[PDB]
Design a protein around this ligand. Structure first.
Ligand SMILES: O[C@@H]1[C@H](O)[C@H](O)CO[C@H]1O
Length: 271
């Protein structure tokens, strides 16, 4: 059996658990052996992971970068070892990559902002909880959101990273709340940060603030259904993982593939 490796940025996020499951299901279907390694949001750990795999008989590397710019060295190592690289969800700024599979994050950010404008109104006072700086995903969602900002004349009270993490999201929101009690809406660049922000609002007795997340994870969708989260932009993590293994199969089979494969987004609201 050929071995495909999946190096994921972290497993402490339901989104990446789903991405891993999607890849696992497809590997099983296509008869591949899937090795999963966790970089734990650490570029140093990611590099060590890739160095390790290059001598394990790995046929293809599926990588979800911890950082789009820092991952370059790891990609170049796979390149030297003649192991084809396919990036999933986040881009690699440097190094040779055969294919990239991800959502349109610029569109996602604009769509989230447009929905805020539709509910809280034009000129609304907003806070943005950004993802990990250095990732294409955070960068693109910010750009998209900025389009909605200019379009809807939003007043951005504060924008700050909470690293796609639920606990950091809670703490950052708690601190921002004390300095900006007049916030009307929050765009959280992923559901984990959105759920943390909701807990901060809960602790603070602020039920009047509209929160929009991103991912459509099981927890994210439940909160929308329970009326706590106003909306989330659903991605298809499982399909990103499956598409990665499928593309890996073609490459190994000598079939040529597209350099970029888009996966659809969907706005999710209650009802
Ligand atoms: O697209 C993914 C998901 O939003 C995840 O929750 C954080 O990392 C991003 O790159």
């Amino acid at each position: 059996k050929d071995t495909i490796a999946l190096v994921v940025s972290t497993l402490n996020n339901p989104f990446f658990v789903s991405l891993k499951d999607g890849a696992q299901k497809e590997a099983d279907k296509l008869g591949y052996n899937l090795v999963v390694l966790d970089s734990q949001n650490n570029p140093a750990k990611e590099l060590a992971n890739v160095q390790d795999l290059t001598v394990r008989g790995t046929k293809i590397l599926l990588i979800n970068p911890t950082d789009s710019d820092a991952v370059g060295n790891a990609v170049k190592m796979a390149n030297q070892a003649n192991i084809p690289v396919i990036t999933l969800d986040r881009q690699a700024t440097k190094g040779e990559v055969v294919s990239h599979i991800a959502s349109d994050n610029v569109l996602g950010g604009k769509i989230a902002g447009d929905y805020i404008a539709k509910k809280a109104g034009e000129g609304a006072k907003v806070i943005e909880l950004q993802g990990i700086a250095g990732t294409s995903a955070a960068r693109e969602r910010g750009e998209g959101f900025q389009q909605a900002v200019a379009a809807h004349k939003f007043n951005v009270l504060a924008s700050q990273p909470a690293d796609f993490d639920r606990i950091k999201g809670l703490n950052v929101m708690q601190n921002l709340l004390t300095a900006h009690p007049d916030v009307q809406a929050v765009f959280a660049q992923n559901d984990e940060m959105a759920l943390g922000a909701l807990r901060a609002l809960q602790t603070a007795g602020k039920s009047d603030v509209m929160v929009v997340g991103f991912d459509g994870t099981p927890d994210g969708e439940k909160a929308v259904n329970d009326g706590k989260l106003a909306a989330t932009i659903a991605q298809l993590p499982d399909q990103i993982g499956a598409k990665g293994v499928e593309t890996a199969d073609k490459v190994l089979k000598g079939e040529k593939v597209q350099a970029k494969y888009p996966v659809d987004l969907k706005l999710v609201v209650k009802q």
